[PDB]
Amino acid sequence: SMSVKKPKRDDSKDLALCSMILTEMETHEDAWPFLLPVNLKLVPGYKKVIKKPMDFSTIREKLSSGQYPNLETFALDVRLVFDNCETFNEDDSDIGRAGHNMRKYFEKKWTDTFKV
């Protein structure tokens, strides 16, 4: 509360660390569905159905331009990619499988980096 703070966490490295994590997402073999925005002209339903489209390139641009105020806003965008993927794709599809794999991949790195 006013003049009562919990101990100051060192957040000075968060930007570098999220960048690193994103770089590792971008270079994963199953990242291909997520690298660029879904083309809303070419994928019927997507615009109407997916209210907040998100992809790795868009995240990279937001990250590099100071548009994440903190590491949690960054994790929210990453997860949004996978939540969108689940909304639009069958679990039993390459893309549905890619999304599950990448979420798992993300969450481990997230935990190892910031929890542990």
Question: Is 32 near ligand 1FK (CB under 6 A)?
Answer: yes
Cβ-Cβ contacts under 8 Å for 81 (sequence gap 6 or more): 34, 54, 55, 56, 59, 99, 102
Radius of gyration of the chain (CA): 16
Q: In angstroms, give the least distance from the CB of 28 to ligand 1FK.
A: 14
43 binds ligand 1FK (CB under 6 A): yes
54 is a contact residue toward ligand 1FK (CB under 6 A): no
- Which CB, 43 or 76, lies closer to ligand 1FK? 43
Q: How far is the CB of 97 from ligand 1FK (least distance, A)?
A: 12
CA–CA dist 92, 94 (Å, integer): 7
- Cα gap 68→112, rounded to integer Å: 21
Chain residues binding ligand 1FK by CB under 6 A are: 32-34, 38, 43, 85, 88-89, 95
